[model samples]
Target: VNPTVFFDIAVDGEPLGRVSFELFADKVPKTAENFRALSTGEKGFGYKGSCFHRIIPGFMCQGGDFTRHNGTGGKSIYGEKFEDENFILKHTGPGILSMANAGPNTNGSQFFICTAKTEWLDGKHVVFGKVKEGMNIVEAMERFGSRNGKTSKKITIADCGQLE
Candidate 1:
């Protein structure tokens, strides 16, 4: 079974909306568990006050760097980092959630959400989850970014947790 998670977002101290996610636990348990555990924050270091450090309209928004919010640092709940769980899912279109890694098998807590079809990243990035609701919020948040993927406004994940 899959687990549901939610992230309440805010921009410049104002609430934007909640983005619910459905993780593919059955197919990718290792990758899915990493995200689920982090959402509950049972390990103390979770994505509560993290910000989307990089954003690009028609592409993806990247974040989950709890240590350094500028896309430089992040740690998995399991350890400092984790392996890339298989790439069974494809980067077909918008709302797809995938892991952001430094290289092969260098997955950390960092992740990204595709706002458009990115076929080039099909086998490179592990597709672990997707947005179930509040995609409009993501579209709105996409506006606060530059052509080079730097967020113009402080888009923070105010809170996050498991739904059920």
Candidate 2:
């Protein structure tokens, strides 16, 4: 299976290098399934241009909001069915990619790429992926902040298609 989760980021028309995402299929099956679907062409989730709507420097970066093109809305405001807690998932380290949600069973397409350590979310949101490369790039771009923060910059997935 492929290991690196590659993210090609660009802001203000500048290439920020390809960032890799390392998925934890064993830790979170359903969450992993969602990403797998996008990667293997079984399904596609993040091709559209969605805002990196939320950001927390040295901590995490959140996007995946499909409700509004600019992330004004959310990803399945009603959320989606989550896998059992028995998946043994935990958000203990950096670059942990997990589903973003409002409440329990409220997860759809919204997901986050963690930059720093996050322990409070352990066992709550499914941690399914991680950044294998371009962590610094994610951090740099994320530092630009969302509209709610000190700055506003859109970090979009742009396009995601198979390489092989």
Which candidate has the top score in lDDT?
Answer: 1
State in Å the error of residue 15, model 2: 1.8
Every candidate's lDDT? 0.91, 0.64
- What is the RMSD, in Å, between candidate 2 and the native fold over all Cα? 3.4
- Consecutive 10-residue window with the lowest summed lDDT within model 2: 75-84
91-145 per-residue lDDT for model 2 (tens digits): 7777778887666766666678777678888767877777776878887877788
lDDT of model 2 at residue 161?
41
Error of 2 at 146 (Å): 6.2
lDDT of 1 by residue, 28-49 (tens): 8999888888888888888988
Q: Which residues of candidate 1, in runs, are more than 4 Å off? A: none
